[PDB]
């Protein structure tokens, strides 16, 4: 027995400058020991949370922005965008029945030559005339959704890295870009980009390390 409460430093964590409120939540690393200071302790930790409590509108009480602690600044762990995800709980909530699920994937590189991969989820709905209880597609139309989802995604990216790409992810401007070309074809309900993952990032760069401090 040692009651670790002592070496259980009730630390804290916040957000960068790409969002709104630089407040995410408190944590608990470990008291500064011998050859294990309170700077290079973990740093590989992460911050998984819905961007609703991360911003200020309960409309986004869905979708979970994925972050990963970089290092400590002001005895307050910073953070950075490692990717975007969709709540597993809201995934089964948007699935009704008698329909068709249209999904797609695509690997893309940014200007900073960052390796990530934006996807896109899609559910089906009827029309203001149709009587059909299904609203399926001739497949050759759902197959056209994949060549158009990747078209859109890989046509705007490859610039300003995910710093400006994530600056359009949160305000869900893609929900009106997907429903933009689809307006001249099929209606579709929900319509979101769902997931995207990043894993090809160099090492600790002090450059964008102070671009998170503001």
């Amino acid at each position: 027995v040692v009651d670790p409460f002592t070496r259980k430093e009730w630390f804290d964590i916040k957000a960068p400058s790409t969002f709104e409120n630089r407040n995410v939540g408190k944590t608990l690393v470990n008291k500064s020991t011998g050859l294990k200071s309170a700077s290079d302790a973990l740093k590989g930790r992460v911050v998984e949370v819905c961007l609703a409590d991360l911003q200020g509108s309960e409309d986004h009480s869905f979708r979970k922005i994925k972050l990963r602690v970089d290092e400590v600044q002001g005895k307050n762990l910073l953070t950075n965008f490692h990717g975007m995800d969709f709540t597993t709980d809201k995934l089964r909530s948007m699935v009704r029945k008698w329909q068709t699920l249209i999904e797609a994937n695509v690997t893309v590189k940014t200007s900073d030559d960052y390796v990530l991969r934006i996807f896109a989820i899609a559910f089906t709905r009827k029309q203001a005339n149709q009587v059909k209880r299904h609203s399926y597609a001739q497949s050759s139309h759902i197959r056209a959704i994949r060549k158009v989802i990747s078209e859109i995604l890989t046509k705007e990216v490859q610039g300003s890295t995910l710093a400006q790409l994530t600056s359009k992810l949160i305000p869900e401007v893609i929900n009106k870009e997907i429903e933009n070309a689809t307006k001249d074809i099929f209606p579709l309900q929900n319509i979101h980009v769902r997931k995207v993952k990043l894993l090809k990032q160099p090492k600790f760069d002090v450059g964008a390390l102070m671009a998170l401090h503001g």
Binding site: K109, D113, V115, K200
Partner: protein
């Protein structure tokens, strides 16, 4: 006059040793002897020039493949993986 029903280039091993043994023999024997396609020309005219090599008569460049087959079941799933890493670090 094919002097075989189920022996082929193994009948040269008569009744000695055993059937089971000689059976598998003919397998990779054929997948070594046969003028293997040289991907360094796309023209198949390269046989087995000693254990693990394929002497090519199409630019005369000897080839590094398999002990019998030009690519075993093992070094096959491996042909894939090295390709995978290549791109991730490429661009």
């Amino acid at each position: 006059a094919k002097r075989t029903k189920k022996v082929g280039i193994t009948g040269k091993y008569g009744v000695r040793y055993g059937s089971s043994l000689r059976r598998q023999v003919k397998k990779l024997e054929i997948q070594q002897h046969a003028r293997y396609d040289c991907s360094f020309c796309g023209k198949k005219t390269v046989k087995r020039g000693a254990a693990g090599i394929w002497t090519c008569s199409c630019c005369k460049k000897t080839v590094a493949g398999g002990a019998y087959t030009v690519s075993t079941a093992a070094a096959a799933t491996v042909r894939s993986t090295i390709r995978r890493l290549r791109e991730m670090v490429e661009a």
